[PDB]
Amino acid sequence: GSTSAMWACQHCTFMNQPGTGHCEMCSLPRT
Ligand SMILES: [Zn+2]
């Protein structure tokens, strides 16, 4: 809801918040 810049994971293939470097799908890091 209006944030900095989300990201697209390369495991679960879902969108994630700019602060959730991990993930709400796989449970892994952004890197
Ligand atoms: Zn993920």
Side-chain angles (χ1 to χ4, degrees):
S2 177
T3 185
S4 267
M6 290 108 83
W7 55 280
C9 196
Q10 320 104 90
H11 194 263
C12 51
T13 91
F14 185 63
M15 178 261 304
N16 215 258
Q17 271 283 291
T20 34
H22 285 63
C23 232
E24 252 289 79
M25 265 68 237
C26 47
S27 199
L28 265 174
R30 224 173 44 73
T31 290

